[PDB]
Amino acid sequence: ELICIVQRVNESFSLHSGFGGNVYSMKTEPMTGFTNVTKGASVINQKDWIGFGDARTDLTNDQFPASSDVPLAVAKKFRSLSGASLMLSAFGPPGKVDYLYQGCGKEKVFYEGVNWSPEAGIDCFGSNWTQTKKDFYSRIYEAARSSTCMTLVNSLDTKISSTTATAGTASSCSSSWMKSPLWYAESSVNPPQVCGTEQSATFTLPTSFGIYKCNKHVVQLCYFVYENKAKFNTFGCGDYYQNYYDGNGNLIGGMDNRVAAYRGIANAGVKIECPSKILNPGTYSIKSTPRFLLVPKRSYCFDTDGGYPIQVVQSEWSASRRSDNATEEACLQTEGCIFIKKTTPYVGEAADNAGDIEMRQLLSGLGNNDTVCVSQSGYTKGETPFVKDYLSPPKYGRCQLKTDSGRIPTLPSGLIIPQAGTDS
Amino acid sequence: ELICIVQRVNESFSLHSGFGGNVYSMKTEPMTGFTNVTKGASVINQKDWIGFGDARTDLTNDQFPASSDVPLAVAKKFRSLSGASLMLSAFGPPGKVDYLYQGCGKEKVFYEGVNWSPEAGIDCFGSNWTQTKKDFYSRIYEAARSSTCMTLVNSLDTKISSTTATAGTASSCSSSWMKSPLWYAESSVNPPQVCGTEQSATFTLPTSFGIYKCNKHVVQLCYFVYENKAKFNTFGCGDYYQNYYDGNGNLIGGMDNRVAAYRGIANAGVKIECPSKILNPGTYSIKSTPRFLLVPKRSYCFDTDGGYPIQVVQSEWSASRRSDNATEEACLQTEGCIFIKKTTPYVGEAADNAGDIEMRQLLSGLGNNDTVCVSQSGYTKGETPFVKDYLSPPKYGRCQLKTDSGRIPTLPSGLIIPQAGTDS
Amino acid sequence: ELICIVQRVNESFSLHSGFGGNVYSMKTEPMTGFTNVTKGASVINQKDWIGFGDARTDLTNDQFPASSDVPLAVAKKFRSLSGASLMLSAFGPPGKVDYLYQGCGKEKVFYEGVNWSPEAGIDCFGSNWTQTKKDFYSRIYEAARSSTCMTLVNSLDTKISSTTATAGTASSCSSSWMKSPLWYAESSVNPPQVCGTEQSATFTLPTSFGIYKCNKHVVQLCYFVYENKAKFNTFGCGDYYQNYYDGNGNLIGGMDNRVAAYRGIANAGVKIECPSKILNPGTYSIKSTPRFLLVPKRSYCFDTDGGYPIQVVQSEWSASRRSDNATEEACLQTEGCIFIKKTTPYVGEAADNAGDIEMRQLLSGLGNNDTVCVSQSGYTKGETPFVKDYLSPPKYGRCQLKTDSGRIPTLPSGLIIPQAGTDS
Amino acid sequence: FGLLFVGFVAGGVAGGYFWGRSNGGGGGASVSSTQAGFDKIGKDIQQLRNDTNAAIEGFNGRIAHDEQAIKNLAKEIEDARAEALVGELGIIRSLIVANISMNLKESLYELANQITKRGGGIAQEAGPGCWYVDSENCDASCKEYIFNF
Amino acid sequence: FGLLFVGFVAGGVAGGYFWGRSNGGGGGASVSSTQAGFDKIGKDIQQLRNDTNAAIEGFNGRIAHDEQAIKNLAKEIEDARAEALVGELGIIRSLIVANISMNLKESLYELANQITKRGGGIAQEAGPGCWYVDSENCDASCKEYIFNF
Amino acid sequence: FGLLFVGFVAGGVAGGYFWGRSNGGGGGASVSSTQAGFDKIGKDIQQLRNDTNAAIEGFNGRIAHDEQAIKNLAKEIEDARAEALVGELGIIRSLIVANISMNLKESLYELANQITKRGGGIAQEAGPGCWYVDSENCDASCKEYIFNF
Ligand SMILES: *[C@@H]1O[C@H](CO)[C@@H](O[C@@H]2O[C@H](CO)[C@@H](O[C@@H]3O[C@H](CO[C@H]4O[C@H](CO[C@H]5O[C@H](CO)[C@@H](O)[C@H](O)[C@@H]5O)[C@@H](O)[C@H](O[C@H]5O[C@H](CO)[C@@H](O)[C@H](O)[C@@H]5O)[C@@H]4O)[C@@H](O)[C@H](O)[C@@H]3O)[C@H](O)[C@H]2NC(C)=O)[C@H](O)[C@H]1NC(C)=O
Ligand SMILES: *[C@@H]1O[C@H](CO)[C@@H](O[C@@H]2O[C@H](CO)[C@@H](O[C@@H]3O[C@H](CO[C@H]4O[C@H](CO[C@H]5O[C@H](CO)[C@@H](O)[C@H](O)[C@@H]5O)[C@@H](O)[C@H](O[C@H]5O[C@H](CO)[C@@H](O)[C@H](O)[C@@H]5O)[C@@H]4O)[C@@H](O)[C@H](O)[C@@H]3O)[C@H](O)[C@H]2NC(C)=O)[C@H](O)[C@H]1NC(C)=O
Ligand SMILES: *[C@@H]1O[C@H](CO)[C@@H](O[C@@H]2O[C@H](CO)[C@@H](O)[C@H](O)[C@H]2NC(C)=O)[C@H](O)[C@H]1NC(C)=O
Ligand SMILES: *[C@@H]1O[C@H](CO)[C@@H](O[C@@H]2O[C@H](CO)[C@@H](O)[C@H](O)[C@H]2NC(C)=O)[C@H](O)[C@H]1NC(C)=O
Ligand SMILES: *[C@@H]1O[C@H](CO)[C@@H](O[C@@H]2O[C@H](CO)[C@@H](O)[C@H](O)[C@H]2NC(C)=O)[C@H](O)[C@H]1NC(C)=O
Ligand SMILES: *[C@@H]1O[C@H](CO)[C@@H](O[C@@H]2O[C@H](CO)[C@@H](O)[C@H](O)[C@H]2NC(C)=O)[C@H](O)[C@H]1NC(C)=O
Ligand SMILES: *[C@@H]1O[C@H](CO)[C@@H](O[C@@H]2O[C@H](CO)[C@@H](O)[C@H](O)[C@H]2NC(C)=O)[C@H](O)[C@H]1NC(C)=O
Ligand SMILES: *[C@@H]1O[C@H](CO)[C@@H](O[C@@H]2O[C@H](CO)[C@@H](O)[C@H](O)[C@H]2NC(C)=O)[C@H](O)[C@H]1NC(C)=O
Ligand SMILES: *[C@@H]1O[C@H](CO)[C@@H](O)[C@H](O)[C@H]1NC(C)=O
């Protein structure tokens, strides 16, 4: 009598092939799946990152932690002061807090800027400080992206040729002036009959500032903007001009109305424009019309040892105040900049403008010890190599790839029968 | 009695190893092979490409389809007009067809240029229009390579300072002048005793033109070329100069013989040179010698949303006419430009110069729905990952790799005997 | 009676898993390991490399092979002459050997420079020849990195406008002058009452030199450096200036003290600075103060057909002489430059400064036929894909990767028992 | 027909492992049961499935590091990277299915071997999972011992 | 010597699968035939070869997307990419050869099992592809039934 | 329990391949030896280990070409490349271990088959590496012939 174990499959069984053996089963289970993506900011390396901020990351604030968008451990990694902003330290407007931002970290978090917004009502003849702001932060992010460190340089070595020019002051600037640029005027110039002498100056970008190496400086090459020659000629003779030169005489910045059209807004009167440029260390020269001279007095110093794409955090007031989105737009037009943005208005716990629940959720990742990827779509853990949707660039770290769920292969489960040979 | 199936192999059998089992066989067959490569132009995505051409892709031509190098379906994807060329629309010479080339497509096919060749005999004081042509198309291809779209900008906002200068006209230019650049002359300048005033102008490159975003403009910064100071001084006082400035006074183009040597060909008389430059949107200024001023009036507007390497198609006349190979040389010296070239002369079906059999073979791929790779060597389908010879760059898509045929592994066939264990 | 082969394992046996079968064994052996790394210079392709040197690679030296740091076969691949250096041929100082360095090779070895060091005591009003040296070699390496070939261009076509200027000579320069730049002075200029006329010149960088194609030229755009306007005014009227222009009037080099500060060292007297620039072929113009004009007379011609990262070999004297480390620092700040450096002083076999044992060990790889990777850490053979420590960039070829030894998987050995099924 | 073969059955009829049996009368008609007490197979399957976690964890633990400064998604490159990873995942899958197959088969062989060594040598193997028993030496209580059904 | 072994033969002599046979007289001399009616093996081989198309199509369908703006061929990078693909193709090959080997072997086992269950149990297996028949119970027409030669 | 199974033993006790044996008295107690003359296994192992060199050489021979002009090490990219190569090396390892396992197992089967065909058919297989001998037909000098111990 022939007695056998007999193997059989149903219509419910399907055949799964293998290299060296097949398997019949009724059920399949996917081999792997997608990794969740969390919105907001985070870091892949908790020992190499730096934050720059204001009251919302300032552990010394009188209202801490209610005034803070990050817990204590994260705040310690920030260089922050209530009322501060990078831009405010760039120019040093009268009566504003003047923090010396400095730090090192391959990953960088920028969460400031709001303390100079249209709400602050700084005038000082600014053509458009929101324009200046956007330009300034575009340069910071551009230089920060390729640097390990950053520091304010709160005083450049400068030198004026004029022995009669004097420091400029304006009612529209609290009856004083910026820290940077310095404003020198020649009160003896009067288009009577008297034209004065061309003004000249040097400023030096150093190769280092304290412990920080400088390969790159972000500075403002300011100039005055006049409506036209006729309106400028109520102040000086000839055409307006302020030109910036390197050590050899190469023009690197300024405004020269001897060759360039006037573009001052009609009847607005004189304005100042302050475009930021990335310059190498060295000594730089200035030539200007006799009556008005502007001279850069500060910079931000960067190295070129490299860094990761940076993270920039939306810095706006609560609804009651007048904000701008300059840092947003700066981040958007700058390579290697990741922007973190709230979906609901800013509502503070301490006061109106400090300690927002949504922001604390978004910044909570700063935060974690198990983030492996940071991207414009958010951050991930190292669960699988896959995400359901793309991780938008900029991005860095162990970053998951998008694949359709259907393309993820399956394994057999729930009652399994092996198959090999042709069985026929 | 021991009865057995016995397995044996000949000297004709060879041993093929496996991970978990070997195989004896007498024959092998290669696992895969090379994919054919077809010369000419094609696209990998039929829903995202654009063509720019002339009569040879103009479905509205009276002789269509005999005048056409592409069938009807392909012609519909082209923006074309009989007699047109990109260069002809750049300058708008008198009595030439002036087509407004505009379109969008990640893949781009340029098949025009021949309608401005030496045959056309355009003069208008051109130093060397073939040089201008090569320079012009180098700029177009350079900007097109990184743009999704392209459009003619058929009129820049311009403004002259001179209240006495008048529009320039030349017998050598059909007793009129280009559309671009505009030519303003001061008839009162006479080196008698009268020198005139320095001429000035602005032109504006817009941030958009109709529905098309502009991040980049290709424009011509023209100037006059004189043999020497003495010969220029029969027209104006001082040295010749025409300089182009951005809004701040940075020199971005022109010819200044106050610092630069004269290089006009001896006894040739005055000439015009028109080098093309890629410029950002904005307002630009001009300063020139009192007597002659040139002002850009058109541009080609591009975005920077990105594109694929472009395809440029040889645009020459039949043998009876005088051609050039400027677009060929422009393509060759420009990154991301793929050039398609005939091996036999152009012989048209309609007339001499429209409807060529070899070109219709070369363009037929424009064409197909199953092209996965486009390269300077031709295009391929997605049959295998391998080609016999290299696919020359530029190239894009699912592009095959070169491997020797010997390095393609084989599988056993024709009577097969398995082997495992050491059998000893 | 049931008789069986019985399989059993000890506590000494460990279980190794496989795809389709496991194995018990007591011993493991690693599957692969690291490839050794040899310090010094080498090449991955003996048929495509070129050397440039001095006596230490000069097979024609009277003391060869004792004066040589490479054997005969390697010396034949060098273009070398005793007493020569790239820099010495750039300027051609009086009484120095003037070798025409020229050659082709994708891999490039630079082993010269020492024959112009502070020891040589060349003066000729050099502000700082060590600075000039570093700048010069930075430009050479930068251009060499992307070129297949290199050649001295020992005479540029030049032309001066002044009919009265005469060739300049200096006691501090052996009572003659450099080959490049040429020095023209106007002896009639005297700030009495006489100021002279602005001096002018052209020099042409050719598109080719002999068989060598030129896409790029390394040239020196020299100028004089004065302490201040007052000290310059004992020589000429106005401010000092020497400006270099391209064919259109774009400033590409020079020193203009009409806009740029004077930076001459106090009481040092007049100095010459000679920064090197990479320029395209073409004709270039010069404008200078009436009394002094400098005109480039040589260049180094390069193509842009591409090359590998270059190798630069420390070129210093023995301890008795005064060396510099300019080529070291040039190499360090230039992408694609690999620097080879001795750890012990230079001690020659022939004389003090030629034929050093450590250098012969370091250069011996030039040398081998089985080098697959060259890097800043040294060179390797193609033994395994792994090295114990990183291969520092720059690097090229089949280059090994760093992995911890623990991550290299193992295979079973010494008495092996197979296992499959669950055995339970 | 005995562990070297797998068979098909229509509409109803349970799939899996069964006892099937021979002739007798000359000629007989055969017969298949309705499933064993093969709980060794149930446990073996559970163990084999869980052991796949090693290869899956190896795959999940491997995520290439990347750095993109660019602001707009490079979809085609992105999709190519994914396609390559899925390719690798596809071959690992094929190895895992075969590894299950071959080890389950072995576990079935080890089941049959246990049966052979209880009716020893009343068993007499006829290829894996098959036996010839003399319905004479050994009977009804005997086969019930040897085969458990 | 019976499906666990493969043997060598000189100059002429056909390769493949044959019937070989034992003792008898004490001591005998053996004997190998000149090939069976194993058309099951011919069909099984054809089927197994065709089933390799799945793995080959998987490989052919996978072509990385690329974009080069550069004008001159980067041969070394180009050759490296090809070498890597050929490497991957080489291991797939090794998997395919083994997959054929192991499934052909199984198909040969399934052939031998059919033979065992026709002389049942006159067969008596002696390892796969081998049997002991009593040249007494079963004879000349009998072996011809059981083994078809 | 006979080539389909591997067993555990405490402190001392040699590991490897042994002769083990049955009943007799009813009921007996069994017995395992202290190792064979299986020098075929020693030689087979040596051969199989050496044959792994083919797959290892294939791996060692494959080094991607690269070109970096950059002056500072890109550690993260560097480590990622290594991790990927080690990943590939890890699966090759898994294939090699299985290839050894399956070929050693086969070599053990070929050892057992030789034994079956010396006591033929006094042997009577009971799954691979196991036999039923009639301690009657064949005795003491007989088993010593068939099994060499
Ligand atoms: C004083 O200076 C102020 C600053 O210069 C100036 O305010 C500027 O005014 C202009 C004109 O009114 C405004 O332009 C508005 O810009 C928006 C935003 O543009 C940017 O973002 C869009 C994409 O937006 C979409 O996605 C975002 C999320 O990412 C959504 O929030 C949004 O709703 C959209 O759905 C992007 O397309 C733009 O890209 C352009 O520019 C970049 C380079 O910078 C190019 O790469 C790109 O190709 C394109 O050209 C851009 O990045 C835009 O959609 C509008 O059309 C419009 O241009 C500025 O926003 C505004 N800026 C600030 C900081 O306030 C003041 O007007 C001036 N005051 C006076 C009186 O002169
Ligand atoms: C006439 O001209 C001469 C040449 O210009 C000038 O001599 C120069 O003098 C300056 C100031 O005294 C010296 O600077 C010294 O530079 C060293 C070396 O800097 C370079 O290397 C370091 C790394 O060094 C470490 O590693 C190397 C091995 O690779 C070791 O040997 C060494 O001991 C260290 O452990 C590097 O960090 C530097 O990087 C800087 O510069 C580069 C760009 O060039 C940047 O990428 C980088 O971010 C950073 O800014 C550099 O590459 C440095 O360590 C010292 O701090 C110092 O700066 C010059 O060496 C010296 N050069 C020469 C050629 O002689 C004369 O002074 C002048 N004469 C007069 C009277 O004016
Ligand atoms: C290994 O070989 C087997 C046998 O050729 C392949 O099994 C075939 O798989 C397909 C499904 O992919 C079935 O439709 C066929 O019926 C199978 N053939 C047989 C004889 O069973 C198996 O696909 C191969 N393994 C791999 C991974 O390719
Ligand atoms: C798997 O193991 C077997 C056995 O070690 C290898 O078979 C050897 O293959 C070479 C040809 O590559 C033959 O010359 C040897 O005779 C074979 N040895 C034996 C015992 O047959 C096989 O190469 C291994 N598989 C792979 C893909 O490496
Ligand atoms: C193939 O399948 C076998 C059986 O599931 C796996 O063997 C297991 O391996 C681990 C060690 O990795 C042991 O702890 C388990 O005891 C093994 N299980 C059995 C039943 O032996 C094997 O790992 C799989 N192969 C691979 C490469 O994953
Ligand atoms: C084919 O066979 C399987 C089992 O051999 C049947 O699956 C069982 O069905 C019931 C209800 O559908 C489940 O609760 C059991 O859990 C299943 N069995 C198992 C594996 O536990 C299946 O229905 C059969 N198909 C048909 C329609 O004949
Ligand atoms: C080894 O064996 C094979 C077949 O076992 C022989 O191949 C046959 O030869 C003839 C003519 O060469 C072919 O027409 C047949 O098709 C082949 N057989 C098969 C597989 O169909 C081979 O010639 C033998 N080699 C030698 C020289 O002995
Ligand atoms: C487990 O078994 C192995 C052998 O079965 C023992 O290894 C032997 O030990 C001695 C000394 O340690 C060596 O010189 C031999 O070469 C080993 N045998 C072999 C494989 O040649 C091992 O000691 C045993 N472990 C224990 C502690 O029982
Ligand atoms: C063992 O492996 C090596 C490959 O390294 C091979 O050359 C040698 O012939 C092999 N020895 C034997 C006897 O198989």
Residue numbers in the entry:
A (entry chain A), B (entry chain A), C (entry chain A): 3 to 193, 197 to 429
D (entry chain B), E (entry chain B), F (entry chain B): 9 to 157
Paper text:
ICV, however, has only one major surface glycoprotein, the hemagglutinin-esterase-fusion (HEF) protein, which possesses all-in-one of receptor binding, receptor destroying and membrane fusion activities. To further evaluate the infectivity and transmissibility of IDV, we expressed and purified the ectodomain of D/OK HEF, and determined that it also uses 9-O-Acetyl-Sia as its receptor by glycan microarray. We also solved the crystal structure of D/OK HEF, both in its native state (resolution of 2.4 Å) and in complex with its receptor analogue (resolution of 3.1 Å), and the structure of the enzymatically inactive HEF (resolution of 2.4 Å) alone and in complex with two receptor analogs respectively (both resolutions of 2.2 Å). Indeed, our results show that IDV HEF is functionally and structurally similar to ICV HEF, but with some distinct characteristics.
To avoid the enzymatic cleavage of the receptor substrates, we generated the catalytic mutant for the binding experiments and for the structures of the relevant complexes. Previous studies have demonstrated that the residues S57, D356 and H359 create a catalytic triad in ICV HEF esterase, which has been proved by site-directed mutagenesis and structural analysis, and the sequence alignment between the ICV and IDV HEF proteins reveals that a highly conserved catalytic triad is also observed in IDV HEF protein. Thus, we designed the enzymatically inactive HEF protein (HEF-mut) containing S57A, D356A and H359A substitutions, and expressed it using the same method as wild type protein. In order to study the molecular basis of IDV HEF and its receptor / substrate binding mode we solved the native X-ray crystallography structures of wild type and mutant HEFs both at a resolution of 2.4 Å. Secondly, we performed an enzyme kinetics assay using pNPA as a substrate at three different temperatures (37°C, 25°C and 4°C). Both IDV and ICV HEF displayed obvious esterase activities while HEF-mut proteins exhibited no enzymatic activities. Due to the presence of cacodylate buffer in the crystallization conditions, S57 in our IDV HEF structure is covalently modified by the addition of a dimethylarsenic group.
